[PDB]
Symmetry: D2
Subunit: 238 residues, 4 copies
Amino acid sequence: KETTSFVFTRFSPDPQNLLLQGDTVVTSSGHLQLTQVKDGEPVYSSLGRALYYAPIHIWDSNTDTVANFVTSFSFVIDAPNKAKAADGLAFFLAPVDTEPQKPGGLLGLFHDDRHNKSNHIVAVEFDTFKNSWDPEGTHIGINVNSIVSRKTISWDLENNEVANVVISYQASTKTLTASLVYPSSSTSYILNDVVDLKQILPEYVRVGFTAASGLSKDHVETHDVLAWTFDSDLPDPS
Amino acid sequence: KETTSFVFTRFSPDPQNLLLQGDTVVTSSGHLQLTQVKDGEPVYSSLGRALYYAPIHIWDSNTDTVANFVTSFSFVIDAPNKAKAADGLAFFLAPVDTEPQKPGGLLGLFHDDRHNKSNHIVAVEFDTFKNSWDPEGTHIGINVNSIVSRKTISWDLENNEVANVVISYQASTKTLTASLVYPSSSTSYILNDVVDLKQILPEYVRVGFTAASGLSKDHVETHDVLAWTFDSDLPDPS
Amino acid sequence: KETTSFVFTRFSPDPQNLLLQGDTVVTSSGHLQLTQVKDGEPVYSSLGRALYYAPIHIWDSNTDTVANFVTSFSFVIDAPNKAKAADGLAFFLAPVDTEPQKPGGLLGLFHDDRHNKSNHIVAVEFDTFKNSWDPEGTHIGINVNSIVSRKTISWDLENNEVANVVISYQASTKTLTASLVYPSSSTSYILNDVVDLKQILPEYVRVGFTAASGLSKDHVETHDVLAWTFDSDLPDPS
Amino acid sequence: KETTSFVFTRFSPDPQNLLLQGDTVVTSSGHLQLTQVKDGEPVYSSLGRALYYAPIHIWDSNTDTVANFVTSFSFVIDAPNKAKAADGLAFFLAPVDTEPQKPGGLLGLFHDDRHNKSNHIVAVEFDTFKNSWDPEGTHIGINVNSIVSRKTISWDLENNEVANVVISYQASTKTLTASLVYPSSSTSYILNDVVDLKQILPEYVRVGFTAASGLSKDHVETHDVLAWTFDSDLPDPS
Ligand SMILES: *[C@@H]1O[C@H](CO)[C@@H](O[C@@H]2O[C@H](CO)[C@@H](O[C@@H]3O[C@H](CO[C@H]4O[C@H](CO)[C@@H](O)[C@H](O)[C@@H]4O)[C@@H](O)[C@H](O[C@H]4O[C@H](CO)[C@@H](O)[C@H](O)[C@@H]4O)[C@@H]3O[C@@H]3OC[C@@H](O)[C@H](O)[C@H]3O)[C@H](O)[C@H]2NC(C)=O)[C@H](O[C@@H]2O[C@@H](C)[C@@H](O)[C@@H](O)[C@@H]2O)[C@H]1NC(C)=O
Ligand SMILES: CC(=O)N[C@H]1[C@H](Oc2ccc([N+](=O)[O-])cc2)O[C@H](CO)[C@@H](O[C@@H]2O[C@H](CO)[C@H](O)[C@H](O)[C@H]2NC(C)=O)[C@@H]1O
Ligand SMILES: CC(=O)N[C@H]1[C@H](Oc2ccc([N+](=O)[O-])cc2)O[C@H](CO)[C@@H](O[C@@H]2O[C@H](CO)[C@H](O)[C@H](O)[C@H]2NC(C)=O)[C@@H]1O
Ligand SMILES: CC(=O)N[C@H]1[C@H](Oc2ccc([N+](=O)[O-])cc2)O[C@H](CO)[C@@H](O[C@@H]2O[C@H](CO)[C@H](O)[C@H](O)[C@H]2NC(C)=O)[C@@H]1O
Ligand SMILES: CC(=O)N[C@H]1[C@H](Oc2ccc([N+](=O)[O-])cc2)O[C@H](CO)[C@@H](O[C@@H]2O[C@H](CO)[C@H](O)[C@H](O)[C@H]2NC(C)=O)[C@@H]1O
Ligand SMILES: *[C@@H]1O[C@H](CO)[C@@H](O)[C@H](O[C@@H]2O[C@@H](C)[C@@H](O)[C@@H](O)[C@@H]2O)[C@H]1NC(C)=O
Ligand SMILES: *[C@@H]1O[C@H](CO)[C@@H](O)[C@H](O[C@@H]2O[C@@H](C)[C@@H](O)[C@@H](O)[C@@H]2O)[C@H]1NC(C)=O
Ligand SMILES: *[C@@H]1O[C@H](CO)[C@@H](O)[C@H](O)[C@H]1NC(C)=O
Ligand SMILES: [Ca+2]
Ligand SMILES: [Ca+2]
Ligand SMILES: [Ca+2]
Ligand SMILES: [Ca+2]
Ligand SMILES: [Mn+2]
Ligand SMILES: [Mn+2]
Ligand SMILES: [Mn+2]
Ligand SMILES: [Mn+2]
């Protein structure tokens, strides 16, 4: 049996147990600022990611076991003009050597808009801009190897409000669940779908966040993570 | 700082750390069977509750602190005729000396359909029967001092399937969140509302379950709890 | 699988999840004061106990499993005259309906100085007074069904200093381990013994503390518990 | 607040969340085999280490906080000739970029036998060979920036038996405690000392094990870790 766990109720400068990629910085208020801010205003065409440094053991070919996990986090998206919000934030699992891909609507996760099994990506996206592959309206999506979500639900961005997210995986039912709550308005969202992690992901992955601002100057927003917990449990064989 | 925590992944036949009230028994399969079953069939006019034996310290007048908590459980409701399902199941917090109240649509929680501040009850209900005070259709409700829910959402019963529930309280925002997921159908439900526990509940409470079958012979269903975890954390001041 | 857990980093007045027996009170400084204090001075012939309210499931006859547990606590003993210290403090496990027994050197645990299997008591004692059944000098003891310890080690009371205790049970090896550290002086003590909990204790027990001051006026000391954590884990059958 | 936690009840082949250094391999029985074994016999002049991949945040200059931690592990040392056992095993904390140093009695931890503040090492050693700087007999030591222990206690190797170790740090008292239990013989050991982590170690460290066999062919032994848990908690200020 193996478990991994971590908690950040806020973030420190130079977090050596996080791998920061692209534009990500830690703010003086202790937030993970994934996309760039300049003179209090979000900057366009910005992309940042942040991964926990240790690989997570998500399944084991030796014992044919698959891990459960649960992650919680708080985030804020602040768009000066909510009608022009872009592009969004995602929580993801990827190969250990994962590097940032294309900006904008591809969210730093994918190189193009196609499905490719060699991506080995599972993600939950909080998508603020309708691209050609998207459903109508802002939405939460479960993504497997593609920016084109397996499943989505409508989600209304509450501009500059704290969102509390929980994402969990139950290996026994192969179900990934994602919920988002805005305590300020008592509004809440949830979806779940079948995702077989053993078939999608390598045995070890890195986990974390990615976010991108829009590719035109008036389609901008901030993407800040305020807090993050993660717990995984790879059980003993049957 | 004070914390309380417990886990049951199944139940043992004479659970001395649970206070069983009314008809509740533990089955040979290790389930908490809240309402009576006879020869594999649910019995009408049955009421059962089950509380954790230890009081939970949910707020402290000495330090003006309020606890967070999170509880998870799995339950099954099996109605032979889904159109005649009644009456439902609830998770609740109540005074330490709480005793079962009226059966049927009052769910063992209340003596009538009014809103009495001296009840000191907070509950999340899974309501299978439309009473005169209910919204149309089966629903999940957040209840404060009344069977008339403060907030409800529609919920479609998946008959005889395992439902996974999480209920959490965030003291800082005074918000109670409840979610239900059916992994078998990939359906999920969530709601949240403002509930100020310090104003509603005494400093110590008991926590647990209640359920009731219908008050006519053809309006019956089982209410079984399969597993239950609970964690509370009363922080230090500031 | 079943687990039980709790933490107190200090104690609140009227702790409704503790069963206080005999003279025990909670002080305004947040200590569990097991033996009586009057005008800042310890009172003789005082006996107090404190138990966690919920029974702990320590073994299960249905699945033939036995729990592991670990408890930690901090305590202070203050004797105005260290040469006349009496009688000491113990951590114990006992039947759920346990009531205080004889004061003084029997520590509220036993009715007499004999071994009796029907006591169903396991205790770790911090013994400050040499009774006729004791080894020479102040000592820590592991007791099973008798005030006459199975195993003891010498322990020098550091008067009015905080002692940090850890007591753990490993079911797989049937070993009970007890350690005490005084961080102020970097002095530490440890002992362990084979104790088969399934043979000694009922399936459910209560856990807690007991302490007694001496039965003559000049043989007195305080016994305060400052903090307490407990965790038990009853595994699934293998 | 920041926490890090992990559990291994056994080790899998190719553990990508461990940094293996020198001779370390994972065996088919799931053990961390720190020093080399050839045809069932320990090899001399062997050195191996194993570190958890993620840096641990042990103190924070921004908030002036210092972490508590607790680690538990099980290990086995098997010496074909117990009188010629060498050299031993240590648990340690070191800078994130730590690399194996000299073999033999320096345990892979140090380049020489001197005290040097720039080592930034805290270790608990299980020392099976008397070097010129050692006390008489096999011993457990607390080491700070030197192979010459700050404090030691006698320890008798129980050859090829499982030792259960717990090492904990209490920031409030700046005390490190280490205990070792052999459940097979009901033998136990403990020591503690003042170690100020903020003054010794960098803000982030790696944690893990090191072990070395003797530098002559007849002074050999195996060093296997069977299981390992670690938990750290860096609190909020105040
Ligand atoms: C809004 O919620 C409020 C809080 O629940 C309600 O107030 C409570 O209502 C209780 C009844 O439902 C009531 O308790 C009863 O007290 C009776 C006698 O009290 C005196 O005498 C005692 C000795 O007998 C003495 O020690 C006391 O100090 C009192 O001076 C007692 O006879 C009742 O017991 C009989 O009936 C119950 C069934 O309800 C049986 O369980 C019992 O065997 C017996 O046959 C009853 O006692 C309670 O019995 C169960 C036991 O576990 C409890 O510990 C015991 O208290 C209670 O006093 C009040 N509480 C307060 C703070 O007022 C309120 O109800 C209405 O208003 C009250 C004032 C009263 O008029 C009720 O009849 C009303 O229904 C709720 N309001 C509304 C509109 O619903
Ligand atoms: C027209 C313009 O000003 N900017 C548009 C930009 O145009 C140019 C013009 C010249 C050159 N060039 O290399 O010379 C390159 C790009 O082409 C971008 C790629 O199609 C538009 O990107 C879209 O921007 C949107 C916000 O407006 C969202 O961020 C949306 O997700 C994003 N689309 C994707 C697929 O990421 C972007 O709006
Ligand atoms: C057979 C029948 O019709 N039984 C019905 C019963 O009727 C009578 C008729 C005359 C008298 N009287 O002596 O004045 C007493 C009872 O009145 C009960 C109170 O309204 C009905 O209770 C309801 O039963 C439903 C299922 O049928 C649900 O369980 C529902 O939640 C429950 N209602 C409540 C408020 O709990 C019950 O169905
Ligand atoms: C005033 C006095 O002499 N009291 C003494 C008392 O005496 C009597 C006198 C008459 C009768 N009787 O059966 O009538 C019974 C007892 O006999 C006790 C022995 O049974 C002394 O108890 C011991 O006191 C010591 C401190 O002085 C320690 O507290 C010690 O642990 C304690 N011993 C025990 C076993 O609890 C107790 O001091
Ligand atoms: C085969 C033999 O006798 N080798 C011995 C070796 O001898 C020589 C002699 C001359 C030269 N030279 O540079 O010419 C090189 C090696 O000197 C080593 C340094 O003192 C002995 O190392 C000690 O070996 C012991 C077990 O025998 C323990 O492992 C002990 O911890 C270890 N000492 C240290 C400080 O690591 C080592 O035993
Ligand atoms: C062993 O302990 C139990 C309770 O812990 C006592 O009740 C026993 O007392 C003896 O048995 C009881 C039932 C009663 O008959 C009494 O007179 C006996 O002394 C006790 N056994 C002994 C031998 O002291
Ligand atoms: C303490 O350890 C460091 C880290 O390897 C050594 O470099 C130090 O050596 C001293 O400083 C170096 C730069 C060099 O000047 C050398 O001559 C010094 O000895 C070491 N310090 C000591 C005193 O041994
Ligand atoms: C999928 O990804 C691989 C690796 O980047 C690439 O070489 C391949 O051509 C992609 N598309 C396929 C197989 O259709
Ligand atoms: Ca999009
Ligand atoms: Ca109803
Ligand atoms: Ca004594
Ligand atoms: Ca040595
Ligand atoms: Mn999308
Ligand atoms: Mn309802
Ligand atoms: Mn004694
Ligand atoms: Mn040494």
